[PDB]
Amino acid sequence: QDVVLGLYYMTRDCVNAKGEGMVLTGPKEAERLYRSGLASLHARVKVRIT
Amino acid sequence: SVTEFLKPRLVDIEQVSSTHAKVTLEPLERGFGHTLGNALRRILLSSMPGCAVTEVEIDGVLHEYSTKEGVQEDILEILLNLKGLAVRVQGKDEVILTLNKSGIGPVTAADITHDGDVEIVKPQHVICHLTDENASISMRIKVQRGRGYVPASTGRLLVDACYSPVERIAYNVEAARVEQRTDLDKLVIEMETNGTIDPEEAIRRAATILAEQLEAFVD
Amino acid sequence: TEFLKPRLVDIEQVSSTHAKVTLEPLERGFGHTLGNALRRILLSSMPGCAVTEVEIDGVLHEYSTKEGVQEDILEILLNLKGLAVRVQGKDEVILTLNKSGIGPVTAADITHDGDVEIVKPQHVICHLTDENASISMRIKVQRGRGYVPASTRIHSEEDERPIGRLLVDACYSPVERIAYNVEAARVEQRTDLDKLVIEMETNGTIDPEEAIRRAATILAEQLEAFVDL
Amino acid sequence: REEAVVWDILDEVIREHPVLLNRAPTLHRLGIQAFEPVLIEGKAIQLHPLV
Amino acid sequence: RVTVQDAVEKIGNRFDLVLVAARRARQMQVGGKDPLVPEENDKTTVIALREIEEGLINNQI
Amino acid sequence: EIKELLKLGDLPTSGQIRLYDGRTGEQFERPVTVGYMYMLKLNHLVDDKM
Amino acid sequence: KPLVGTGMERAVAVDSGVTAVAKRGGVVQYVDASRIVIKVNEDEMYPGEAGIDIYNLTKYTRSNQNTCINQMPCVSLGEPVERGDVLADGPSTDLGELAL
């Protein structure tokens, strides 16, 4: 149950957020963006993916 | 005992790539695996100095909104892909470089006008692909010295700056033991970095940044 | 490269036990990075000074009782565990205590020394409650760091202690809570210079002007392994 | 005597000897399972959360 | 390493993998032979499973 | 009436407080409940069963 | 003490008989965590008696389940007490409230 709670919380979208709407080159700088507190985790974004 | 706390040695450089390594320390006193792992994390990911691409001027554009033809991927992607280029600037605050290429095929950072004063530390970085018998593109790329990661908050095209060379850093603490107790911490630091600097030395730079703060308190 | 380095500009010993200290200026993030590192170090690793054994004249084990005293011997040990003292250049010392006649017994009754200094004379050990009543006891203090429970300690001593000693659990670490806070301040006509405030509650044996430097020292030497790699 | 060597021996004995944990009742085959042990200071059996 | 499925790809009956891993581990522990895989001071339990990974064991041997 | 008592203390009447994680000093997202439950040690303590 | 209770603790701890309860009113004459002794007042004394109620408290002893049961004083020397006041806490009580 707690694992799924965490994954639900991690993957929601909140229509207002810090750092919302920018475009990123990958998960790693997604993480740098999260961890430094520059973007909120459920903020909307576009990323390059593979 | 009273002021001779246990000190680690590196148990390994544990190296798996030139881009990424898993530098592990043992033993650390209980709880110090965070107190250093995260402290060096917060240094490494946000306050390491370095040089990065900062602004772009492709030939004749006001906004990457304009999807100029002759290129396969549109200017929004060229703009981020040029953020992907790792660069070294020697002794200067900001430096502009010029790039051009012609003929049907890819474009690479190797095609930049390499000043030698500046090193493009990964030339084989593809920039775009060209799509007509007449396809050629020419642009100015600004590179700048700065610190950390700075978002797009502040014909020029602005872009976020990746001044810190750390692509990712992560750390764990885990059980370690000696002959009579197991409440001590191991620390694993894992990091991956853009090739400007080797990681087992980037951390030695960062440990210095942190050490320099303490220099005014240490007796 | 533009890093401003800190100095520990100011201190406020708001009480005989509580104090504030401030480190100023700091760059981006370093207010947080030191702010938490020093809190976590100050809680784990400041050395201090604890009672460690007690011998009371006529008692035999922790669970007994003494005629004419208001506490079971056990609650005397729970009281002395909280007693805190400085010691000057010593790894340990023995304190004698004597009292007779009705009324409280308090740390002020310990046979004082120049080389021991007690933070709070009024910390109370028991009551005496009969006209002829007495207690005499030899409290042994040791320096140390962290916490060491007596069960592991006697398992670490490996000789057999005599009948009629009592053992207490050791709680050396002298800081009871630490808080940190970060804010901008007037320097060089510029913004984002953090005045770190660290403010602290203690058992009273130490002063921040040592404590923050000692914590910074511990950090500075633990960190050597990461530059010596 | 629990001498200082014995743990470094133990951490060689056990180093990959599966031990079988089962609750009771044990309704179905998944109710006995084997795990590689790792040593602990306390007295509880530390089980994996998902299991 | 622990999951034996890649050894079961080679001994397509899973019961025969226990009979073969035991037989081979006995040739090591009891019969006095030594492994064709590089050992890492693993138990014979693991060495014999690591001998299926080299693809050089079946119950002919 | 609980709110009224919490207001008489100088306490936050939401009952919740923002907390930080002592592993990093990061703030938790959204406040969390904090307060004085009563807890009993039960007579099933472990060394009596190991 | 539990900080939140129901006010039934003031009854369970007394009626369960394990706190030592003042049989007659008076003043505390002596206390030492083994004895408590009460100079009962003459308004509740019986005429030929010395007029002094000792309470020898039970100290560390096994419960039937091996938990200890040491009673401890709650009074002070010279303090007045009234019939039915708690003189000494039981196990799991303080000031006569239940306190598990």
UniProtKB/Swiss-Prot annotation, chain C:
It is an enzyme of class 2 (transferase). (Microbial infection) ADP-ribosylated on both alpha subunits by the phage T4 protein ModA. ADP-ribosylated on only one of the alpha subunits by the phage T4 protein Alt. It comes from the Bacteria. Changing R186C: In rpoA101; temperature-sensitive. GO terms for biological process: bacterial-type flagellum assembly; bacterial-type flagellum-dependent cell motility; cell motility; cellular response to cell envelope stress; DNA-templated transcription initiation; intracellular iron ion homeostasis; nitrate assimilation; regulation of DNA-templated transcription elongation. The N-terminal domain is essential for RNAP assembly and basal transcription, whereas the C-terminal domain is involved in interaction with transcriptional regulators (such as CRP) and with upstream promoter elements. This is DNA-directed RNA polymerase subunit alpha. The chain holds residues 6 to 234 of 329 of the full protein.
From Swiss-Prot, chain D:
It comes from the Bacteria. Transmembrane segments: none annotated. Disulfide bonds: none annotated. Belongs to the RNA polymerase beta' chain family. DNA-dependent RNA polymerase catalyzes the transcription of DNA into RNA using the four ribonucleoside triphosphates as substrates. The RNAP catalytic core consists of 2 alpha, 1 beta, 1 beta' and 1 omega subunit. When a sigma factor is associated with the core the holoenzyme is formed, which can initiate transcription. This is DNA-directed RNA polymerase subunit beta'. The lineage of its organism: Bacteria, Pseudomonadati, Pseudomonadota, Gammaproteobacteria, Enterobacterales. The gene is rpoC.
From Swiss-Prot, chain E:
One of its GO terms (molecular function) is bacterial-type RNA polymerase core enzyme binding. It catalyses: RNA(n) + a ribonucleoside 5'-triphosphate = RNA(n+1) + diphosphate. GO terms for biological process: bacterial-type flagellum assembly; bacterial-type flagellum-dependent cell motility; cell motility; cellular response to cell envelope stress; DNA-templated transcription initiation; intracellular iron ion homeostasis; nitrate assimilation; protein-containing complex assembly. The keyword Nucleotidyltransferase applies. The keyword Repressor does not apply. It comes from Escherichia coli (strain K12). Promotes RNA polymerase (RNAP) assembly. Latches the N- and C-terminal regions of the beta' subunit thereby facilitating its interaction with the beta and alpha subunits. This is DNA-directed RNA polymerase subunit omega. Transmembrane segments: none annotated. Belongs to the RNA polymerase subunit omega family. Its EC number is 2.7.7.6. It is an enzyme of class 2 (transferase).
From Swiss-Prot, chain G:
Belongs to the RNA polymerase beta chain family. DNA-dependent RNA polymerase catalyzes the transcription of DNA into RNA using the four ribonucleoside triphosphates as substrates. The RNAP catalytic core consists of 2 alpha, 1 beta, 1 beta' and 1 omega subunit. When a sigma factor is associated with the core the holoenzyme is formed, which can initiate transcription. This is DNA-directed RNA polymerase subunit beta. It comes from Escherichia coli O157:H7. The gene is rpoB.
